[PDB]
Amino acid sequence: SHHWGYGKHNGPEHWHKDFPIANGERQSPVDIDTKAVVQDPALKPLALVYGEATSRRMVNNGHSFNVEYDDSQDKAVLKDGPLTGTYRLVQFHFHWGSSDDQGSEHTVDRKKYAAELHLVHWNTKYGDFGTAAQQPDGLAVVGVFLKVGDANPALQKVLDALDSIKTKGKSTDFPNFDPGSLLPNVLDYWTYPGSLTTPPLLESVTWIVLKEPISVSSQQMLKFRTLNFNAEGEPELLMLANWRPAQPLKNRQVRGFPK
């Protein structure tokens, strides 16, 4: 039902068994070596059209939680940046570690943040997220680093719903949440072709990792680790860590905007 996980017996190092692509040529995340970042005059500023974003529910997916958005129409889309076309926001989720010194999937010159936010979008040229996820130009995910420091009020509404989705599969109504409240003021970004960091690990993601992190308090981070990987009736298993480590960059180029 979701055999893969982040434990020693089913963690990232074993995903390749059920998902051979785990050892693919465009796997994410990757460490971003700023010294090797390339400047592409063709890159444009990110166009996050989230004004009419309509959040629906928060769901415990068995490895983290998703804040789902109505992607039935172009209510909240991602355009420009390194993209061609329109990409609808379908859901966002986070990745975190068991301690504040780790948790982010992408790293900056080996630097790890406490957590990492992923805003998932899909190319409207495909009719649906699933079909989109099968094409290299199908998905666009904006990664946002959460840096331990000042408590972040915008993160409040999210943390408050966690006690309502403790176990795998549990969901809760989660209306009127502005996804843009989780974005930094400066939208400088790094971009490279990659994949979803969780199985099926499809290589259809144009990664857009923001250079500027947003804040989160150590106390707020404790909150993320209170969730359960398990379904009610199963042994309790806390969601202490759900990040995939950096994967081989291989023949990929990380571009940076504005540089």
Q: Which residues are annotated as a binding site for Zn(2+)?
A: 93, 95, 118
Annotated catalytic sites, by residue?
63
Q: Which residues are annotated as a binding site for substrate?
A: 197-198
Which residue's structure tokens are 């966690």? 162
Residue 244 touching Zn ion (CB under 5 A): no
Q: Who contacts 30 (Cβ-Cβ below 8 Å, separation ≥6)?
A: 106, 192, 194, 246, 247, 248, 249, 252, 254
Q: How far is the CB of 42 from Zn ion (least distance, A)?
A: 26
3-state class (DSSP) for residue 125 = helix
Name the minimum Å distance from CB 84 to Zn ion. 23
Closer of 150 and 216 to Zn ion (Cβ): 216
Q: How far is the CB of 246 from Zn ion (least distance, A)?
A: 14
# residues near Zn ion by CB under 5 A: 2
Q: Which of 118, 116, 148, 144 is nearest to 221 (CA)?
A: 148
21 or 44: CB nearest Zn ion: 21
Binding track, positions 184-223, relative to Zn ion; x by CB under 5 A: -------------x--------------------------
Q: Which of 5, 30, 19 has its CA nearest to residue 248?
A: 30
Contact with Zn ion (CB under 5 A) among 88, 106, 118, 168: 118
Residue 130, amino acid: G
Task: For residues 174 and 191, give the distance between their C-alpha atoms in angstroms, rounded to a whole number.
Answer: 30
Contact (Cβ atoms closer than 8 angstroms) between residue 12 and residue 245:
yes
Annotated binding site: 93, 95, 118, 197-198
Pairing mode, strands 139-148 and 115-123: antiparallel
Amino acid at 258: P
Residue 210 C-beta: closest distance to Zn ion, Å: 14
d(CA 47, CA 226): 34
Q: Which residues make up the interface to Zn ion (CB under 5 A)?
A: 118, 197
